[PDB]
Amino acid sequence: SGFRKMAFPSGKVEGCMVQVTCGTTTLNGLWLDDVVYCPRHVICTSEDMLNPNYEDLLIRKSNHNFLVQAGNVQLRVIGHSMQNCVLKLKVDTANPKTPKYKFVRIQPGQTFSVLACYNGSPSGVYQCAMRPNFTIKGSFLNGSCGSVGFNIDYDCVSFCYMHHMELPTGVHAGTDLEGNFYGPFVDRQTAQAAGTDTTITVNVLAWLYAAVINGDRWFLNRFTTTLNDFNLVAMKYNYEPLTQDHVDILGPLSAQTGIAVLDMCASLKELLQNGMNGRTILGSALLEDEFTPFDVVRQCSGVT
């Protein structure tokens, strides 16, 4: 029993983290096979960062200007290319610690683990969600760029995120491992505002199911509702609209607990309209939205 914000074990990713230096800029790269992936802004002076022409900046750079260090051993760079907002550094050695991996571009509301890194060294691991506005609420200082977000399926690491930016409002923006930003963000030091950060409704409901399973039940009520009625309440409180897809995904949690998705929605509706009245749920005073239904099943069943 008990329910915790849980990150994947970080070992398989720790073995991929390297340091990339170009001129005087240092940040993190990801070494998979004979390719090191890093944010392309590794080529920028912070002057460059106001309005960088990456194509023009990168003409000035050769293979030998990319200093790649894995632990205390230097990697020989034999090629470099720009793919969207990342550089791919071809090195002469395949990472012997390359796990099975995929690159996946996640949907908003999906959760992943971040291994926060500085000079290609891990400092810590935490669990995140891709917010509906395609920001993540991270913990990142200068040098953290190139830290990666991931999921693990038994032995296969699915990389979904590379860290690039902090927005002036202290939330985080970044790319898939093809170098495409989540959201409308660019790798430029410019006015970039986040949209409305909506609550991930299906995740809150999964979390309410997690609570019931763990004995926290005070918020179960006598009521039910409809998808249309619930969605009017959701709109008013900046919750994502709930779909029959969301209902379907919550099915096994519904089946395990014997509480109908729409009953649980009616519990959520009352919590939204009445607040928690100073009570807590799984030791939280607000409604948690960074567990997926998959996350709740996994933690509540003990998948390794």
Place this chain on the structure above:
Amino acid sequence: SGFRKMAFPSGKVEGCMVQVTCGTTTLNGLWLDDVVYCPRHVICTSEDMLNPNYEDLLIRKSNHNFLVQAGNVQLRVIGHSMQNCVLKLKVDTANPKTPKYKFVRIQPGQTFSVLACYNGSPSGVYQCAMRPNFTIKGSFLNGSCGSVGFNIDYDCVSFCYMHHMELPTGVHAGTDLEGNFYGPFVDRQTAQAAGTDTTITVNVLAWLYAAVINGDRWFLNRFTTTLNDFNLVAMKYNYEPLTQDHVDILGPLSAQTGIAVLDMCASLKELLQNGMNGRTILGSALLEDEFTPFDVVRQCSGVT
């Protein structure tokens, strides 16, 4: 910027986790050098767990009855001894993945990472605190026993916790790596109630300093207080008394922020007396007590 409940990278510990089977009981062991450490209740039938005589049960067990599996390779057990509530299984092979390590018995209020494991396989990592009542608020299912709590200092893993029990109230009890329980708990399926779970006052204050650093400042007030005045409020709200030791430890956070410890105490006092009025602090609706001052410095400076 941003502030997250962050676990140590788990790689160095993942490489130590094994499966221990005795008769039909399976749980996790920790393989360091040529010794596998596991909970001694690995020798129990769940019948045994009502009132086990471990000395008497262990007479019935030989080296070959302890099945130790690391990945899919079996370890040869050449010796077994009971130290307090753990077994030490001497194997014929030193773990090649043994990191630098110590065994440390932590104080209540100190934080550590747990690598939750099942059949010697990692499922996830989260950050915990040793509560003042020597419980931890974990996430553990059947098979999770032998999962370990740790801190990492650059390259040295300090093991502080091995998982043994869930109390009837769904909190967790366990031992240092010498097999001594934290708190008054025994490895027996009996009436065991936790004492008063008090809030770790110095950790809340460290967390308030973390908030200020990250721009969350609304709770800073015009007031100050004294250690004696603050402690009267702390007593009333089941907060640990604050000592000059606690003040000293908060010094660098005080020095970095320019907010006197006793001013911050006066902010905490008002939060205790008035509550949060529906506001949040670092995205929490309650006062977080599972970051140490060391945790706040580390995350806010980017120590690897």
